[PDB]
Amino acid sequence: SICAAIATVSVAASTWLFCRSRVACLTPYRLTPNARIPFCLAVLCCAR
Amino acid sequence: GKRQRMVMKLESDKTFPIMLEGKINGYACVVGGKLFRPMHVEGKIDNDVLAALKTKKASKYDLEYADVPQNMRADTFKYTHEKPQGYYSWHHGAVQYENGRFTVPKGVGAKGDSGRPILDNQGRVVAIVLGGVNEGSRTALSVVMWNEKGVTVKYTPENCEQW
Amino acid sequence: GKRQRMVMKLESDKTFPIMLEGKINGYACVVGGKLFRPMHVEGKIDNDVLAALKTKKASKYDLEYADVPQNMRADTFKYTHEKPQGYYSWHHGAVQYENGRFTVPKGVGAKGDSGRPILDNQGRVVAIVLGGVNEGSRTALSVVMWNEKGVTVKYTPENCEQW
Amino acid sequence: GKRQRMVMKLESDKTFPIMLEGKINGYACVVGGKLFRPMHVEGKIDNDVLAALKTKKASKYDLEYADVPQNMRADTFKYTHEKPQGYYSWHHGAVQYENGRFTVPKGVGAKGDSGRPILDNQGRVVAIVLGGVNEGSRTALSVVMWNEKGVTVKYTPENCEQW
User: Which stretches does the entry tag as region Ribosome-binding (chains B, C, D)?
Assistant: First the structure.
């Protein structure tokens, strides 16, 4: 029970930080009126 | 004199106010097929087309953005990233761009004039006014702008008051 | 010209616009001692006397209707069952009546054009506009009207727009 | 003639209306470092400084009061308790003070003109208009006033209607 709780908290927190970093990557690039995404930050953050 | 008339001629149809029980508290911006609108200004869009949409949010950059349809993308503002230092046109006259900072002389500035874009001598939007802070005699602006790479940079001085 | 001015003189007294938050969405008509209001138009009637009256609804004919107070009964429009072909009047110029179809030359008729009573060559209401469609170079309308028996008749062309 | 101009010159900056979806229903009063505002008038304060406060209530005396800050206490109305009988200045002309009662001639008086202070020939507030009752030809007022001891006396005739 405690190992499943530790693993659950760790996976949920890592997924939360991943979504936080994806938002932090794509927030400056979406407010621009040109609406383009560069080559590296498109595929690595699933931006399309 | 004629600068305010040019601002009223350029921002006539493209600028829509935000109503809140009859009070004008902010102004949206239609540029690049995008509808910029701040967080702290809360109310209904005076335009009927722009009100029936869904705006994606960005609380860190203090911007709500949406997708303007294709039948209105030609009637938008212009935008650029190449900007030298000196003078620019604003709705209440002139604004100084010094050391990468927008400064407005005192006397003007209250609650309600948030979202007015900053124009140049050609007719392109270089910044969007979001807040202001009183600095001695000459106030500074907390705005957003773009760059050559394409990253929306939000400039915010110390202890600003939201308008 | 000349026709629209007496219609403005009539509409200044008895045709009442509705009050959406900043604009006008539709027009309540007071005819024969029975207040009429379209359904898709939502807001508040300008008179505090006509606001408090609860309306009965008729979804087949797209009109709320309520009873007019006794003082207001003499200051109502008049209604006519008999309409011959030709030209009738309207707030936006003239309207053609041909084969039982109120049609209008295009360029006019948009949102906020609802409940405007089509008058006649005497000053009596023959129809109430609820919307229309652009039939090529000339738009037709979707009105309710009356006949010889006393039966409210609604006509609506194909794919009309609720104005 | 000139009395209404003197009322508009004295009550220009110190009188703030109360807004309710664009409707003017009442007027507050800034006197003695205090903000008087009635109960039945509900809405938002047009001034930005006076709206962001907390008003202590008194339902028996029908008054909400607050503390005006020190940077605005010099720009208030004046107040006194020494009043003789006769005539006084009001926003719609003159008002008679007879037997300790304020009377206004008919023709004027509706819903919305609540909270207007009564001035004298020197420029001091002697009463605050809260309600009125129609008495024959000459209406009476239901107001508040002060005395020599310092007790706020609320005068209310029979069967008044709140404005």
Answer: 1-14
CB contact under 8 A, B32 and A34: yes
Chain C residues in contact with chain B using a Cβ-Cβ cutoff of 8 Å? 21-22, 111
DSSP secondary structure, B71-102, as one string: TSSSSSBEE-S---SEEEEETTEEEEEETTEE
- Please report residues of B whose CB lies closer than 8 A to that of C21: 19, 44
List the alpha helices (DSSP H) in chain D.
Answer: 2-10, 48-51
C162: DSSP letter: E
Tokens linked to B19 = 């109503």
Sorted by sequence, the CB contacts under 8 Å of residue B78 that are 6+ apart come out as B31, B123, B124, B125
| Closest approach of D52 to chain B, Cα-based (Å) | 13
Cβ distance of A35 and B79 shorter than 8 Å: no
The residue of chain A with its CA nearest to that of B76 is A33
Indicate the helix (H) or strand (E) that contains C13: helix C3-14
Give the up-direction half-sphere exposure of residue C150: CA atoms within 13 A in the CB hemisphere. 1
Question: Is residue C81 flagged as an active site residue?
Answer: no
Q: Which helix (H) or strand (E) holds C8?
A: helix C3-14
D31, D15 Cβ separation under 8 angstroms: no
Q: Any idea which residues of B carry the catalytic annotation?
A: 40, 62, 114
Way the structure was solved: cryo-EM
- Which structure tokens are listed for B150? 């394409």
